[PDB]
Symmetry: C3
Subunit: 542 residues, 3 copies
């Protein structure tokens, strides 16, 4: 009939496993409930939220979600939230019992664990409404409407759902959330009254979790991976994690330190977070001053600026670099001018110069008589992600022989303070790999060494993530159903620590990014045993 | 050698260890799969397709895929299919045996179950060829070329492939598919001859499934989740699901009711389905009438229209709202005009007014002498997804004291009839969350209550979906291999019904969306036991 | 009542092991095809999985247009073979490895998918840098990765040799005539390094496993049949089409670069044609063949090319100049009294503004009917013997901008594999019809079951969980002649006056044969029969 004759003839003693039917096992009798709790706020006057979970009927819990009520932002100036605002709010999270800390994570590490989860990232705050830079005109004008963001606190209790869930029978569980200053989660200009905003802003958190009421629970001991972070000394290529006895993994990455700067940047693309989006935003900001259509030489620029009239030929020569500038519908009384030194950096008076005007090759557009502006059609340039990641301070630094920032006062007023706590590398997109070589030593012996980021490639492949780190995985054994595979220590032979040594690729000293400080971050996942005898407790595997 | 000495020494016995590097290859049940396609029996007012599966060699089946041959669309006017046309075709699907209905789903619920599946959605019809609004010029001009769409009928028999598959214990399985009217799956204008199209259109279905010929099948009873929806009365914040005895989940969402309207809308973005795409399409449609370049006052607009000449400063004042309009290359004989009341709403003669022209702040462009039209460069506006989702009827409703629709006859002729059966909320993107509070009661007692959509956040996280609903999950136990965890009823205490009560957000009476009728939809997944003794049969768990 | 514990689990003690990421430099050998050999012999390397081949791409200096094919790393691979002293354990053809990784976005990005690598860069001076040196990572997906440590290739004190055969550099490069490929081909050398996750296992308990080995068969040019012989235990059978560009110079009018969407391919083509399609000139335009029919646009704006009307309106046109439309830019016809495929007719509206400063036409909006097929027509077919007309009426400037595309993994008849050219599929086991279809329902099931947007007409026989079970296979009957799989397709009929009708097709049939992995006295595989 419907089945082909060749198949029916091929089919129509050996022990065979049933693949078409299964005995439906009766599970443990339980009832789940989505429980939300309001916390206790406390105040370096850091904001701390405490959530106490104690209920006879709450037998187990998993899937922690922290909601945050972002207030209405009213006033004058430019304002916007950092992408994934909710995760950036978190400085530290700790789940503890009467016997102490059961599990804890640093804000950045929780974000790193959720970077592959698109849904969790969108929930935490990723919209044009939240992340684009909105402007307030009147002192009562609404810049940002109030919104609620949801931060998924990924814990090891979620790995195998009910099986991995944190059991809390006859024990009090306290979820403590430490918040980063509101400065970190906000991108604003000088016009914005941050002083008042910081005073008026208050974190409004509410912890939600999936609670389980289990009838006659059969609690058995489990294993947990607890992350440990070590941040090296400023620009130092070495960091050491002490007392390493049973580690499942070791992650190594770099972070920029903007202490020597005012955290002000020329441009920000807002919601659009692609590398091209960052570059286009920068080009757009520079173009206002780069090509000027004026009646006689342009005014409102520093004496230091070298604004040159574009010849009939269209080509302007800034040293070896040629810039083709051709604007249409230019009035008979006006000429086309090019700012030949918009941003320039040099450590010596007659040496190499890093000039941003030289990074442009062709600028075409049409002058609008109605709006008295220049509408740019096509731009041919060599601007990179690093250029957009240079803090304004480094252009006007003492290392610079030249003035540095030759932009108009109008353009300089549009600069934005960016204090994102989770920036990696030396650029906003973490594009540039500054680690030339990695060395990992377990005790005094070399555990691993690499010249290329092959550990990052394996991390990206194995975790199915596009934003991985140089990670050394020691556990390839299935989680929850097995005791994780760990590096075994030998205290007697001094093999009880992990020492990381990197070799940073050095930059040109005449390039402003050379002066961006670096920090080596080393993350270690230590193995602990969860014991439930007389309350919940953890014990370090040694 | 290749392995580091520190590792070699660390390893080079007493404890019992599970083999993680090898496994005993289990011999499976002897079977042979086959992709079987069947032509059905068409019945009619609603189109019904019946597919009879009766074969001794077809032991089990799963993965139902319904194919649909869409005809060539010839004639005059604007025409396009709704996105994911194939799913929108479906009104109801039912898999039944001689012992009755085994499993059934409402068209919208099948779509909601597949909303996270990008592949299944693309297969059902998501292309510029199908969804963009094409125009026919001559009565024989081809608007749409014939195409075939594939609708994946996701059933509980697919969860664990061969293990979950529907077994055919020498029984006749009848797959019944009820189709929605062709009006629902089509977006057209007044120019399109729908009358003839509706008469000429016929659903051409073909049911495909993966059939399995199993040698010596060992059938065991299984469990199934059957969905049951309840739609509450027009503009009512309550709905009750009766005879709830064993439920695995409960979903709650809103649907708009467009009965009081002609289902006509000003704009549609076509294939491009982003929120910005919907907004841009609307702005584009309004701009034709909003800014006019004419020799003297513009003509072809109602007497009710207040078209004002743009002054030398460029700013036009519509009450408190200021509109900056500056067009380049305007001929000496012509002037720039702004329609100050393109679309307006009001309930009283001298109260608040919702004017779409006020929603604009800046309009810049250049007049093209060659095409005699205005090419808009940049638009600064406050137009939202709700504005685009307002049916034209509401602008010209009796409630409105003003005329309402002050557009040109040209613009009004371009309006499109949208009858998508799966619209949620009050806008085309289901952006606006109109549920301010949710209350779910099991009898007299409150089972669950929320002020924020935390149940929607959990649904989105747990299902890895970007388009979730406020869902209460009671079953966190692995499917197929276990009896699902259900909310247990108490008939004696009157706890055998689920009552849902919402608190809708209060809107302004001078805003046309206030008059968009709402309907509360509550979906319940009831647990049933699949019995194979003397044919396939289902029994409600009570 | 007896209940299964769903809230707790006995944490099983695993096999004592220690993993290590091991990288190895190979031995290069030279139809003078480049071959890299990697010898893995270590007493302490007990097992291995997750093979990643790194490639150091050199600095490209010189003149002309140059760019790498998307996912350059995968396209470099012609064949990969993992073998022991007992012979080949597992092997795959370059295209099949790519097809197995097409659903993996991460692996694809690693192999080379960037604006830096895939956009078409231009070199102006003989020392100008076209492309900066870069390193690409190719994930060699093997059956040893399916269940991580459980599926891993065990090395029972045996020598494992990973052999990688490389495709010519011509395949992975998109270049113009201006680019000195002759010198580039001589100077280019593949620089590979094989990485894998090695495992040192204390007291390993090796048990025999099962492996699926892919076998492809390519049919003769324009033959709708292909047969896979000695089929005894197959888990799946994939059927697809590949274009053959032997009868062409592999030159194409346009390429979109990094932007790989269907619209991106179309927009790139429209952009290339627009330079010649609408001309603003002082008197009739020059520099075009005599065959070209460039017509002046009337005051009305509408130009009539037969039944097709083209609205052309350019702003700020000088008083001494007029707007001209090329009414036959690219045309094809088999007879002088037949239907004509004219690319100029595929346009309905062209609007723009003439820039006096740059002496150029800046196009604002284009209304056209150009498709993915149009963008996939090799230039050779426009100037084909079958065409009674000239064919390519473009300027010499436009013709010089054409790019040589030799991507080895092109499927169907278009660059996006959009057009389905199989009207009917017939699969025969022996001489009896095993499966037959009129629609690509096997492709729909493949796309659904594998969660891939780029599937093939695949017949899956194994729906049993991998590694933990012996795979379900189509059982053969040699006595009844049922020991071969014969595929017969019916190609979808195309119009003879459309240039794409002349694209030579090749039927590709892939069979996954079941083998048993034996570890007694070294690693060995045995074909299940
Ligand atoms: C969701 O499907 C599950 C099925 C449960 O019901 C049973 C009765 O049917 C099985 C089928 C059909 C199987 O193929 C296996 C299986 O291959 C199996 C299993 C199973 N149960 C196990 C329990 C433990 C403690 C360890 C290993 N286990 C197992 C089970 C069952 O327990 N595992 C093994 O045989 C081997 C050799 C190794 C380890 C495999 C890891 C531990 C699993 O893949 C694990 C991560 C997990 O996915 C599974 C244990 C699954 O269980 C859960 C809760 O996730 C099962 C595949």
């Amino acid at each position: 009939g419907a089945m082909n004759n060749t198949i029916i003839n091929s089919l129509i003693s050996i022990k065979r496993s049933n693949v078409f039917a299964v005995d439906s096992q009766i599970p443990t009798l339980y009832m789940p409930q989505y429980i939300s709790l309001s916390g206790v706020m406390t105040n370096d006057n850091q904001a701390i939220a405490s959530f106490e979970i104690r209920d006879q009927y709450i037998t187990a819990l998993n899937h922690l979600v922290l909601s945050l009520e972002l207030p209405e932002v009213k006033g004058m100036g430019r304002f916007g939230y950092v992408p994934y605002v909710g995760y950036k709010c978190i400085n530290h999270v700790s789940i503890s019992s009467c016997n102490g800390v059961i599990w804890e994570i640093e804000g950045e590490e929780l974000y790193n664990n959720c970077i592959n989860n698109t849904i969790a990232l969108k929930h935490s705050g990723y919209s044009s409404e939240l992340n684009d830079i909105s402007i307030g005109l009147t002192p009562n004008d609404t810049i940002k409407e109030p919104s609620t963001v949801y931060v998924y606190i990924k814990t090891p209790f979620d790995v195998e759902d009910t099986f991995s869930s944190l059991k809390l029978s006859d024990s009090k569980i306290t979820v403590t959330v430490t918040f980063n200053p509101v400065s970190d989660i906000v991108i604003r200009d000088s016009s914005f009254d941050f002083e008042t905003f910081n005073k008026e802003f208050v974190y409004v958190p509410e912890l939600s979790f999936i609670g389980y009421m289990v009838k006659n629970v059969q609690i058995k001991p489990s294993f947990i991976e607890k992350p440990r972070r070590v941040i090296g000394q400023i620009n130092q290529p070495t960091a050491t994690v002490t007392e390493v006895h049973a580690a499942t993994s070791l992650s190594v990455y770099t972070k920029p330190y903007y202490g020597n700067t005012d955290n002000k940047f020329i441009s920000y693309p807002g919601y659009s977070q692609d590398e091209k989006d960052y570059i286009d935003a920068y080009v757009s900001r520079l173009l206002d001053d780069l090509v000027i259509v004026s009646d006689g030489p342009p005014t409102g620029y520093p004496e230091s600026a070298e604004i040159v009239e574009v010849p009939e030929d269209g080509i302007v020569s800034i040293q070896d670099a040629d810039v083709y500038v051709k604007i249409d519908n230019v009035p008979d009384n006006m000429s086309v001018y090019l700012h030949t030194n918009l941003l320039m950096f040099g450590t010596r008076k007659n040496s190499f110069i890093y000039n941003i005007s030289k990074k442009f090759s062709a600028i075409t557009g049409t002058y609008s008589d109605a709006t008295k502006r220049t509408i740019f059609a096509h731009i041919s340039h060599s601007i990179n992600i690093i250029d957009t990641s240079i803090p304004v301070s480094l252009w006007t630094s003492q290392r610079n022989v030249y003035n540095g920032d030759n932009r108009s006062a109008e353009s300089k007023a549009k600069d934005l303070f960016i204090n994102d706590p989770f920036i990696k590398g030396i650029d906003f997109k973490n594009k540039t790999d500054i680690i030339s070589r990695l060395e990992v030593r377990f005790g005094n012996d070399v555990l691993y060494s690499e010249n290329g980021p092959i550990s990052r490639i394996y991390n990206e492949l194995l975790t199915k993530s596009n934003n991985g780190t140089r990670t050394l995985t020691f556990n390839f054994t299935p989680k929850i159903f097995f005791r994780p595979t760990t590096i075994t220590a030998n205290v007697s032979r001094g093999k009880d620590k992990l020492s990381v040594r990197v070799v940073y690729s050095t930059m040109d000293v005449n390039h402003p990014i050379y002066y961006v400080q670096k920090q080596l971050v080393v993350v270690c996942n230590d193995l602990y045993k969860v014991s439930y005898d007389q309350g919940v407790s953890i014990t370090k595997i040694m």
